[PDB]
C-alpha cells in the first residue's frame, strides 16, 4: 500500500515504511550492545509506532524495559550502569547462580515504571475500567509492602542501580520478594491471580492510559528453552497473560553455564532462549513491518560483511569482463531484481565477547557506537528515491504499490507512469510465455517495444533508460529461469560466426550490468565502482 511522491527537487521518493514490531536475538550478547540500537530508533522515531516487541537472552530484558515504556534517558542510565555479574547469587561456593536475585531487580525495575504510569492516569476511573486499576494497585502495594519491610525505597532509577552495588541491601531484597509465591491456588484448585506483575498487567495498564499515550506500552513476548521438552517456548501478553514478566525474562536469560535451570508451571526445566542462535517471530505481523536485530561475534561479523563486499565487487568485475570480452553465466551471483526491504540489524559485539570477563569503558562505548551506526546505516536503506517514476514502479512490485490508475486524485505523472509499467509487464510476461512454448521469434520485437515505451512515452534520459531497460531484461531473464540469456548467447555467437553485428549485443550488455548501478541514483554510465 505504498505511494510514490515527487520531491522538492524533481525526484521520486516512495512512502517510508512503517515498522510496528521489534525482535532481539538470543545470543551471547550483553545488554550494552542494544543501547546504541535503541538510541538510534529514538533519534529517528522508529519506536513510538511500535505495537509489539520481542526478545530472547539479553534481548528479552532489553525488550522488557521497552515494553514498560521507560524513558530513553533512564534506559541509558539503566543499561550502561547495570553489570549482570553483580546480580549473581550462588547458593554457595562451587554452585551455579540461583537466578532469584536477577529476577528481583527486574521486578523492582518494572514496579517503579509501572507505578509512574498509574500516576499519570486521570481519576476517576470508568466502570468497565474499574477492575483493571484495582488489580495493578493491589500488586504494587505488595511490592512496596515487602520493600518497606526491608528498608528500601524505590521511586528513582538510580536507586535501583546503587542497590546492586550493595550486597547488604541486595540480600535484604532477596528475603523480601522471594516470599511472594509463584502460583496461588485453592478450592476448587482454580488458579488465582498471580501476585506478581504479569505480561497481562502490561495490557491492563495500557487500557487505562489515554489513547494519547497508549503507545508507551508494547506487547511483550519472550522465548525460552525447555530443557525437558528439548524445544523452544514462547510467552506472550496474548498467549500467556498470567505469566510474570520478571520470571520469563530471567528465564530467557538464564544461561545454564551461569544459572541453574528454571521451573516451569509443570516443573519442566527452563533455560536461556538463545543457547543456540535463534530469531523469534512476532505472531500477527508481516515480515516487512518487523525490525530484526542480531548480535554476531567479531569474526562472524566481519566474515559476513567481507563476503558481501566481495560479491559486490564481482558484480562490477563480471560486467567489465563482458565488455572486455568484446574486442560464465548470469547466475553469478545473488542478484535480486525485485525490491525486498532489509530489516536485519547486525551488531558487532567485538571485544565484548562472551569470553571477556570484564570489558573496559573504552570497548564498551565501542560496542554502542557500532550498534548506533549499523542501526542508522540500515534505516538509511529504507529511504527509496529514484530519478524517474517508472523506475520505481518497475523495481518495486506494482503489487506493493497503491494502484494509481484506480485513484482519481493520483498525479497524472504517476498515473501515466503506471500505465507505462503495465504495458511493459504485459510484454514481459509474453516473452516468458512464448519462450517456454519454444517460440523465440518475437522476443526482439517485444523488447524493442519495451525500450520504445521507456524512451518515447516515459521520456527517460539516455542514461536513466539504460538502467530501466537493463532491469526489464534482468527481470525477464529471471522469470524465464535463464531461457533468455541462453538464447541471447546463441544469436550473438551465430552472428560472430558470420562476421555481422547483432541485436543480442546490447541486450546481453545490459543483462550483465551491475544491479547495484541500475537501482542507484548514480548519474554516470557503467563505471559505477563502489
Amino acid at each position: 500500500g505504498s505511494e510514490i511522491s515527487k520531491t522538492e527537487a524533481g525526484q521520486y521518493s516512495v512512502s517510508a515504511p512503517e515498522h510496528k514490531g521489534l525482535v532481539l536475538s538470543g545470543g551471547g550478547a550483553k545488554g550494552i550492545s542494544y543501547l546504541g540500537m535503541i538510541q538510534a530508533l529514538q533519534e529517528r522515531g522508529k519506536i513510538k509506532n511500535l505495537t509489539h516487541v520481542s526478545g530472547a537472552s539479553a534481548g528479552a530484558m532489553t525488550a522488557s524495559i521497552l515494553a514498560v515504556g521507560m524513558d530513553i534517558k533512564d534506559i541509558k542510565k539503566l543499561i550502561e550502569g547495570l553489570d549482570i555479574t553483580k546480580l549473581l547469587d550462588n547458593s554457595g561456593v562451587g554452585f551455579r547462580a540461583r537466578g532469584d536475585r536477577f529476577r528481583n531487580i527486574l521486578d523492582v525495575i518494572y514496579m517503579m515504571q509501572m507505578k509512574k504510569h498509574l500516576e499519570s492516569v486521570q481519576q476517576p476511573i470508568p466502570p468497565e475500567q474499574q477492575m483493571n486499576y484495582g488489580i495493578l494497585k493491589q500488586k504494587i502495594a505488595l511490592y512496596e509492602d515487602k520493600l518497606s519491610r526491608a528498608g528500601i525505597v524505590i521511586n528513582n532509577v538510580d536507586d535501583i542501580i546503587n542497590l546492586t552495588k550493595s550486597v547488604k541491601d541486595l540480600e535484604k531484597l532477596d528475603k523480601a520478594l522471594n516470599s511472594i509465591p509463584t502460583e496461588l491456588k485453592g478450592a476448587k484448585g482454580e488458579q488465582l491471580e498471580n501476585p506478581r506483575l504479569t505480561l497481562g498487567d502490561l495490557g491492563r495498564l495500557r487500557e487505562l492510559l489515554p489513547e494519547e499515550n497508549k503507545h508507551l506500552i508494547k506487547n511483550l513476548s519472550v522465548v525460552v528453552t525447555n530443557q525437558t521438552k528439548h524445544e523452544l517456548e514462547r510467552y506472550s501478553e496474548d498467549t500467556t497473560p498470567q505469566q510474570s514478566i520478571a520470571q520469563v525474562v530471567q528465564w530467557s536469560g538464564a544461561h545454564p553455564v551461569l544459572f541453574v535451570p528454571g521451573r516451569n508451571a509443570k516443573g519442566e526445566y527452563i533455560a536461556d532462549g538463545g543457547i543456540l542462535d535463534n530469531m523469534p517471530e512476532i505472531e500477527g505481523l508481516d515480515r516487512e513491518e518487523v525490525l530484526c536485530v542480531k548480535a554476531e561475534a567479531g569474526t562472524a561479523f566481519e566474515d559476513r560483511v567481507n563476503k558481501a563486499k566481495q560479491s559486490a565487487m564481482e558484480a562490477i568485475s563480471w560486467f567489465k569482463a563482458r565488455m572486455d570480452s568484446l574486442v560464465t553465466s548470469s547466475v553469478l551471483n545473488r542478484e535480486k531484481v525485485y525490491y525486498n526491504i532489509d530489516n536485519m540489524i547486525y551488531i558487532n559485539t567485538g571485544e565484548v565477547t562472551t569470553t571477556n570477563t570484564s570489558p573496559t569503558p573504552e570497548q564498551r562505548a565501542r560496542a554502542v557506537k557500532n550498534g548506533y551506526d549499523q542501526t542508522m546505516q540500515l534505516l538509511d536503506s529504507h529511504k527509496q528515491t529514484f530519478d524517474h517514476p517508472l523506475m520505481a514502479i518497475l523495481y518495486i512490485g506494482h503489487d506493493k504499490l497503491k494502484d494509481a490508475l484506480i485513484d482519481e486524485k493520483s498525479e497524472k505523472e504517476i498515473f501515466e507512469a503506471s500505465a507505462h509499467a503495465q504495458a511493459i509487464l504485459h510484454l514481459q510476461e509474453q516473452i516468458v510465455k512464448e519462450m517456454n512454448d519454444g517460440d523465440y521469434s518475437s522476443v526482439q520485437n517485444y523488447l524493442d517495444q519495451i525500450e520504445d515505451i521507456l524512451t518515447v512515452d516515459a521520456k527517460m534520459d539516455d542514461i536513466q533508460k539504460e538502467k530501466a531497460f537493463a532491469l526489464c531484461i534482468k527481470q525477464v531473464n529471471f522469470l524465464s529461469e535463464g531461457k533468455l540469456e541462453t538464447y541471447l548467447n546463441k544469436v550473438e555467437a551465430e552472428a560472430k560466426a558470420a562476421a555481422e553485428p547483432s541485436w543480442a549485443t546490447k541486450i546481453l550488455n545490459l543483462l550483465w550490468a551491475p544491479i547495484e548501478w541500475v537501482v542507484s541514483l548514480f548519474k554516470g554510465p557503467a563505471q559505477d565502482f563502489k
Partner: protein
C-alpha cells in the same frame, strides 16, 4: 507467421472489451468490469493458407486515458474505433479518434469503424446509412457488430487481415 499490432479505441461502455472476449474466447458477460489502463492478448487466426498473429491492445475509454493513447497506436498496423448505436455522442467521439488516428498514427494503418450494440435496434440512435456514409468518405472499414449475438465480430477482424 505474419505478426501485427491491433488496438481497440472508443468511448467507455461501447463494447471494446467484450468484442475481444467474443473474438477470442467466444463468450459474453452482461456485467463486465471496466478496463483499467489496457489489457493485452494475442489471438492467432489463419486466412487462406497463411497464418497471421494479432497483438491486440484493448484500451480504456475514459477521458483520462486519452493522453496514454499514442503509446498504444504507435506501432499499430490496425485500429478498431468502436462506438454505440444507442448513443449518438459515442459515434461523435469516434470521429475524433479517426481524425486523431489519421493525424498521428502510421499513414499505412488499417483503420476500421464499428457500430456496436447493434442488437439494441430498439434503442438505436445512430443511422446505419449515416455511418456507412461517413466511413466511405473517410476510407474506413465499417460494419455493425454485436458481442451479444456474435454478429460481425469475427467478420470485422478478418476483414482487416485481408488488407494486412
Amino acid at each position: 507467421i505474419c505478426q501485427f499490432k491491433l488496438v481497440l479505441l472508443g468511448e467507455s461502455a461501447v463494447g471494446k472489451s467484450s468484442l475481444v472476449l467474443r473474438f477470442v474466447k467466444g463468450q459474453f458477460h452482461e456485467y463486465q468490469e471496466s478496463t483499467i489502463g489496457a489489457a493485452f492478448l494475442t489471438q492467432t487466426v489463419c486466412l487462406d493458407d497463411t497464418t497471421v498473429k494479432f497483438e491486440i491492445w484493448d484500451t480504456a475509454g475514459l477521458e483520462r486515458y486519452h493522453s496514454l493513447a499514442p503509446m498504444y497506436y504507435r506501432g499499430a498496423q490496425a485500429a478498431i474505433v468502436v462506438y454505440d448505436i444507442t448513443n449518438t455522442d459515442t459515434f461523435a467521439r469516434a470521429k475524433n479518434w479517426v481524425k486523431e488516428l489519421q493525424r498521428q498514427a502510421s499513414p499505412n494503418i488499417v483503420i476500421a469503424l464499428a457500430g456496436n450494440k447493434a442488437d439494441l435496434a430498439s434503442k438505436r440512435a445512430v443511422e446505419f446509412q449515416e455511418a456507412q456514409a461517413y466511413a466511405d468518405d473517410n476510407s474506413l472499414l465499417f460494419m455493425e457488430t454485436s458481442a451479444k449475438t456474435a454478429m460481425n465480430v469475427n467478420e470485422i477482424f478478418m476483414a482487416i487481415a485481408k488488407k494486412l
